[PDB]
Structure 1
Amino acid sequence: LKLPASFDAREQWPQCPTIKEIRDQGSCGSCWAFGAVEAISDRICIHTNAHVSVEVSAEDLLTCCGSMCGDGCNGGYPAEAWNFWTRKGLVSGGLYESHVGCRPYSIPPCEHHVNGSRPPCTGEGDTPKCSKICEPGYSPTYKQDKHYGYNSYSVSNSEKDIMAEIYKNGPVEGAFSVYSDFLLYKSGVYQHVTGEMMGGHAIRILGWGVENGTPYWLVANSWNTDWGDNGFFKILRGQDHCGIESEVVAGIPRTD
């Protein structure tokens, strides 16, 4: 209760479907946008006591943020994603071909270093256009459909601070240095052992726990459910491992 040994947002906010949700960024380096919108989704539902529960649109953020956020499918930055939500807001939008919400994701699901029936993920494709319109059959206007953030912030490189933030306000977006052995993750607690550095990856942190004395963070990847542990993974917590505790960002939904 002053930080229990383990915490899982799905259990704290059982009426919030998005927290339990794994998405797929497709052949696009949109991890920066998915960890952001995934957490925004979660916080919207947490902030409203599930009175409002929507899929925030990775599509809106990825196509419309623009240079502020980086280079679309060519990679981007978490801090600027949340800042963009506080100023321009984000509309709802679901999975590929879901017809859910205002602007569903337009990049098809693919296999991310795993065997499946979807085509393998090819590189970072092109970034779609920013079209401020909702799908036909979605009643409210894109403008009326925007959900703004009251604020955004970078949480310090502090384990306690990160736990307290998730505990009180919900899931966060974080980022870490990906080494080759992370691609191969299947289950258990991920700890870097072999491999070279492949740049960084953005994700959603939604909990923490302890596996046989090993503290870990509960994370959602954006590589579909057939990757890793049903799309989630665990990673060593408390050691700023692969920088897991250095790039944490979040913010509070704007009520109105």
Structure 2
Amino acid sequence: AEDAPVLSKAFVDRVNRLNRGIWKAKYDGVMQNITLREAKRLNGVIKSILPKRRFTEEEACAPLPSSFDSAEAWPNCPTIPQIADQSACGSCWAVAAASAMSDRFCTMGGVQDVHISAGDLLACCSDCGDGCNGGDPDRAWAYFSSTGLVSDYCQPYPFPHCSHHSKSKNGYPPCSQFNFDTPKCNYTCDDPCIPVVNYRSWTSYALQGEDDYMRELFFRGPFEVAFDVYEDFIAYNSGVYHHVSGQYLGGHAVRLVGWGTSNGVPYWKIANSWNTEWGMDGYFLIRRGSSECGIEDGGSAGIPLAPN
């Protein structure tokens, strides 16, 4: 909608006061100068077509910890702790997915480093939605079930690291400088000196509610969840976020990579698709058990098929 910045030092300070210092919102953070229309852009979930997840007796009848990081359960999967930068697209839906299919190619797919192309997914699945006007996580995985994607070595994400700071530590351009339409769906690799490689799942499925999220994350590794972003979420800097103030900005897809307890507050460690500048080194914590902003509502995962 408006060119109205989303963060006001009244707003942030009211939010900070409301949240009961459980999580520090921040005014002069990395999103301070953000536009209503920009922030809505970032949240690209629009619109089950996947079968619901069946736990084997022993999956369901097992003892999940009360902390868990995928990075640490899988020290040898470099894909996990890497943080993506969707950029100035409503591409989170695709970026969220590819990030986890990369990770699952390691956790199960017997391929250490392979970054699945959010490029490929974001352009070529017209089933999923309309590139950078947003799409459906469910579909993303159904396409990796049906069609399959190429790696980011083949169709590297076509939008650079842009920043939402004046001065940037990691010396990025501003995101207020760009705004990107769906890219050309290509059928060979960007470089022609590189061959195409199909990567697919032999089964995608869907998840629901606190528990299923923890079993699925544990056994099979990070996967893709969405929640409703509220203005307040933009100012987030530390601690376990929960919606206290601000208008709804759309549905935003993120990679669930952990859970844990902080001074008696249940949380989900999550990998946010906006740079490593935003939140806590690119990640955020969100309240868990409340299904806060509906995080525990819709979850999308799959088992990467090991090639040849």
Same fold (TM over 0.5): yes
Q: Which string of whole-angstrom CA distances, capped at 9 and with x for unpartnered residues, describes residues 76-130 of structure 1?
A: 110000000011111110xxxxxxx111111122224786352134575211101
Partner of 1:4: 65
Cα offsets for 1:199-218 (capped at 9, x unmatched): 11011001101111001001
- Partners of 2:215 and 2:179 lie apart in 1 by 35
Structure 1 unaligned residues grouped into runs of 5+: 94-100
Query: Partner of 1:61 in structure 2?
Result: 121
Partners of 2:178 and 2:163 in 1: CA distance: 12
Letter in 1 for 2:117: S
Percent identity over paired residues: 50
Per the alignment, residue 155 of structure 1 pairs with 207
Match of 2:90 among 1, 8, 29: 29
2:108 alignment counterpart: 47
Do 2:91 and 2:122's aligned partners in 1 also have CA atoms closer than 8 Å? yes
SS in 1 for 2:79: helix
Q: SS of the residue aligned with 1:21?
A: coil
Aligned: 1:118 with 2:173: yes
**Cross-structure match for 1:98:** none
Please tell me the root mean square deviation across aligned C-alpha atoms, in Å.
1.7
Assess if the C-alpha contact under 8 Å between 1:57 and 1:92 holds in 2: yes
Residues 114 and 227 in structure 1, CA contact (< 8 A), matched pair in contact too: no
Aligned position for 2:250: 199
Counterpart selection for 1:246 from 297, 305, 308:
297
TM-score with structure 2 setting the length: 0.75
Q: How far apart are the structure 1 equivalents of 2:284 and 2:260?
A: 12
Q: Is the 8 A contact 1:112 1:223 kept in 2?
A: no
TM-score, normalisation: structure 1? 0.90
For the residue of structure 2 that corresponds to 1:118, the secondary structure is coil
Task: Return closer, same or farther for 1:188/1:114 CA change in 2, 3 Å cut-off.
Answer: farther
State which drifts further: 246-255 or 235-244. Answer: 246-255
Deviation of residue 255 (structure 1)? 2.8
**How has the CA–CA distance of structure 1 residues 242 and 92 changed in structure 2, closer, same or farther, with 3 Å as cutoff?**
same
Which position in structure 1 is the counterpart of 2:130? 71
2:160 to 104, 108, 111: 108
Relative distance call for 1:152 and 1:115 in structure 2 (3 A) is: farther
> Match of 1:81, SS?
helix
Deviation at 1:151, TM superposition (A): 1.1
Q: How does 1:128-207 map to 2 (within 5 A)?
A: 128-136=183-191, 139=194, 141-142=195-196, 145-156=197-208, 158-207=209-258
Residues 94-105 of structure 1 mapped to structure 2, 5 A cutoff: 101-105=153-157
Q: Does 2:69 match 1:18?
A: no
Give the paired residue count: 243
Larger-Rg structure:
2
What amino acid maps onto 1:91 in structure 2?
V
Q: Structure 1 residues 19, 28: closer, same or farther in 2, change over 3 A? A: same
Q: CA deviation at 1:52?
A: 3.8
For the residue of structure 2 that corresponds to 1:226, the secondary structure is coil
1:243 Cα deviation after fit: 0.4
Q: In structure 2, how many angstroms separate the alpha carbons of the residues matched to 1:227 and 1:138?
A: 36
Please name the residue that 2:39 is paired with.
Answer: none
**CA 1:26–1:167: 2 relative to 1, 3 Å:** same
Q: Is the 8 A contact 1:74 1:124 kept in 2?
A: no
Q: Who is 2:149 aligned against?
A: 90
Q: Which portions of structure 1, spanning 4 or more consecutive aligned residues, are displaced by more than 3 angstroms?
A: 112-115, 121-124
Q: Is 2:87–2:175's contact at 8 Å kept on the other side of the alignment?
A: no
Partner residue in 1 for 2:18 = none
2:76–2:112 CA contact under 8 A, matched in 1: no
